[PDB]
Write a protein that binds this ligand. Structure first.
Ligand SMILES: O=c1ccn([C@@H]2O[C@H](COP(=O)(O)OP(=O)(O)O[C@H]3O[C@H](CO)[C@@H](O)[C@H](O)[C@H]3O)[C@@H](O)[C@H]2O)c(=O)[nH]1
Ligand SMILES: O=c1ccn([C@@H]2O[C@H](COP(=O)(O)OP(=O)(O)O[C@H]3O[C@H](CO)[C@@H](O)[C@H](O)[C@H]3O)[C@@H](O)[C@H]2O)c(=O)[nH]1
Lengths: 456, 461
């Protein structure tokens, strides 16, 4: 009674980890379920067969297969990250098809695709294999995507003309402003194209699985259904977290120890952790200097993760940290290990989905600073829907003016203020997020139904 | 007989505040200095909510037997909520004074009165002038470039406002302006949809109803521009280039006492020749945001150049330890208001970061000082564009900066400064040639003095 699923995730951090965690989650709930993961090399850069294979504790039911590398797109499409990936992935079609045929057996029960790989549904179709969608984001994002059915092909959401006009999208309860919409929605350079080409097929999958939980978004899932029947079942099976923590870019831990030892010396819940995603979107010098001054004036202790050159900081800043020791800067960080630390009391996040889920898992309040993509949307809903985060910005993006130290300092104080409201809902979101994946929890129930539908 | 036939009188109604007033008085003197029988009466538009009182003027018009000042009933200013566009706020104001202009005129009218000399923003008086058979003369405190844009507005109705979204490679050709002027350099008023574009129109529309247009510029600077204005529209009244009209002494102001005035200049004295950079962004008091201030402060330090920074900002706004450093090494100094011409004339100044107001540019050219352009409001953007792309007498930091622009970072400022102060800069040689030309304009036999002669002859003819 063996069943096999083919997993084709997208290259990255917030797209590969949760993918494997999902593989482990499923195989843990069906001894007879085996999974093949097609490891695809993101244009040259690592993050491939080193992490996807390391986390692979030889898990018997999870196999790894490397697809040969390919000539990335014309480095011209970089104008649009979205349109860049969509093209690179579509170029992997011949190989994808090729590889499936080579391992296809009457035991292959379906393909599990990342949102950016949803175009490959036509390959599975050729082999009579149903395809499932794996969204590393939330249901609100799905809705935004599922809401584009009422669009054209040449247009580009508001035609890049956004200001203060509200949009009504089935899925999110609150009216959604234009400024929280992802960058691709306005990217008339292939950005809107990609989101459209991809969202086109959502309703063509056998089921859509989402890295979220019921207590957090059942209301939207029910609204998506209630609003449309052509939509396949949705499976909330999250959170899907890598509580272990990606080893690299840490071959050893010389610095890994520095960060934790430093946090071990701070008063409980006094530190605010700032970190802005894996990509490492480095803010310009001005923004860095302003965030630095903001931090000093605020008086809060802090662990700031960034990739800015030392000379960029305001004069006196670095000395002041290494002397008064109220703060510290570092490059790549053990985010999960950090958020797990008891000294942490606040998080200035870019609002990537995982960062938000990990933060909720540990009951750490968030001061929002979205940057690229659906981050604004996450930020928007975080502050004005689930009330678990304070807003510094929710419409910020690559192009906005610099955020002044004054604003930052204010947000900082509000976020660390113990009597703020944000601290309340947070502990509740922690309970909920954690009761979601225990036996009897809403996500484990979903896993069973998903595995049942997959192998029935 | 009895010289009665020669006497003549002019009525001066300029716009409020320096930048507009200073040019008006210096023009009154130039004229009165060239016709011992021409008398001028200046209407002091007593702006409600502005310093420049009779204290400023009566300083320059002291001992000028041919010039008298007459105040007007300080009428309640228009609603501060119409200030959504400065331009429109002013036009509305100056127009609420007409009743007083017409009243005052009646009280001092005579048959000697040969004309009305009004400020660009006061062209609405032309009619009051006609109510007395008095022709009106337009005195433009800006340059022929600004005239060229203004006169080009008649090529579009009073509603089809310049596209406030497509200012990129959407170049606009403006008669009078040689270079293919961009749209990002067009004044805000051109894009303001709340009284802005309207004002620039209701005012410009009247430009052609004047006996002549007097510009504070000189022939060696824009004769090509002027020639181009006639070749295009055979209805533009005569243009008289009579500048530079500068107030080289500079009048006092509470914002700068003797001590300060003294320390500033004594300080400059200790500085090496052409080692200091002056930074001044107008009199309008238009101040920068905290973040931008800090960026300028860091940019100045990293650049290693001496400096004199005029600005109003709390000490709690500057980079920590910036002021201590400043007054510790004395490599820079900060003042509130500044004796700008005294400074621009001081041997130590080697560069000027200016918001590009016209008087400032003119003073900077007079003293052969290079400017690093940082336009902000009004027509400053166009002035900076021509300052860089046309006359090549200045360097661009930002030729399109305006209300709502990203903060200009220290790295960019630093690099702009080092270039400004570069001994071997193509502009340096062009600046001294400009300095020379602007000064000959007003020596006997100069284009401007020859020009003021035909003007006075025209007015009193
Ligand atoms: O210094 C760092 C930065 C990140 N992380 C980890 O990296 C992951 C970051 O994932 P996420 O928060 O989702 O951010 P990104 O991958 O940078 O963001 C992209 O992918 C997310 C998942 O789809 C989307 O929600 C975002 O909008 C999209 O920009 C998390 O597990 C973090 O713990 C670290 O360990 N250290
Ligand atoms: O601290 C200071 C600041 C200014 N000034 C003097 O003030 C005048 C400034 O005139 P200008 O450079 O023209 O600036 P503004 O008056 O602030 O600017 C408005 O008026 C100008 C004259 O029309 C226009 O060209 C500009 O675009 C418009 O913004 C000059 O004579 C300066 O020497 C000082 O003496 N000390």
């Amino acid at each position: 009674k063996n069943s096999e699923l083919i997993f084709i995730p997208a290259p990255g951090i917030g797209h590969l980890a949760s993918a494997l965690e999902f593989a482990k989650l499923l195989t843990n709930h069906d001894k007879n379920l085996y999974i093949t993961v097609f490891c695809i090399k993101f244009p040259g850069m690592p993050f491939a067969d080193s992490y996807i294979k390391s986390v692979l504790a030889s898990q018997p039911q999870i196999q790894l297969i490397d697809l040969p590398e390919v000539e990335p797109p014309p480095q011209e499409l970089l104008k649009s990250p979205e349109f860049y990936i969509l093209t690179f992935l579509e170029s992997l079609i011949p190989h994808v098809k090729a590889t499936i045929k080579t391992i296809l057996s009457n035991k292959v029960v379906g393909l599990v695709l990342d949102f950016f790989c949803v175009s490959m549904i036509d390959v599975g179709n050729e082999f009579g294999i149903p395809s499932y969608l794996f969204l590393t984001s939330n249901v609100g994002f799905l809705s935004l995507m599922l809401s584009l059915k009422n669009r054209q092909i040449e247009e580009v959401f508001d035609d890049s003309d956004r200001d203060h006009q509200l949009l009504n999208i089935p899925g999110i309860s609150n009216q959604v402003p234009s400024n929280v919409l992802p960058d691709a929605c306005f990217n008339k350079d292939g950005g809107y194209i990609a989101y459209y080409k991809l969202a086109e097929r959502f309703r063509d999958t056998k089921g859509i699985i989402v890295n979220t939980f019921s207590d957090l978004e059942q209301s939207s899932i029910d609204a998506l259904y209630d609003h449309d029947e052509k939509i396949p079942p949705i499976y909330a099976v999250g959170p899907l977290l890598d509580l272990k923590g990606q080893p690299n870019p840490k071959l050893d831990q010389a610095q890994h120890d520095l960060i934790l030892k430093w946090l071990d010396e701070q008063p409980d819940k006094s530190v605010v952790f700032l970190c802005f995603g894996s990509m490492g979107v480095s803010f310009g010098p001005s923004q860095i200097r302003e965030i630095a001054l903001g931090l000093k004036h605020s008086g809060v202790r802090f662990l700031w993760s960034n990739s800015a050159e030392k000379k960029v900081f305001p004069e006196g800043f670095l000395e002041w940290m290494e002397l008064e020791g109220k703060g510290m800067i570092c490059g790549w960080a053990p985010q999960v290990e950090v958020l797990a630390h008891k000294a942490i009391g606040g998080f200035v996040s870019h609002c990537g989905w995982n960062s938000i889920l990990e933060s909720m898992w540990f009951g750490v309040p968030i001061l929002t600073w979205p940057i690229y993509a659906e981050q604004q949307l996450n930020a928007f809903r975080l502050v004005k829907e689930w009330g678990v985060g304070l807003g510094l910005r929710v419409d910020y993006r690559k192009g906005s003016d610099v955020v002044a130290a004054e604003e930052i300092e204010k947000g900082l104080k509000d976020l660390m203020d113990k009597d703020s409201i944000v601290h309340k809902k947070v502990q509740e979101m922690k309970e909920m997020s954690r009761n979601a994946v225990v036996d009897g929890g809403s996500s484990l129930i979903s896993v069973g139904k998903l595995i049942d539908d997959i192998t029935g």
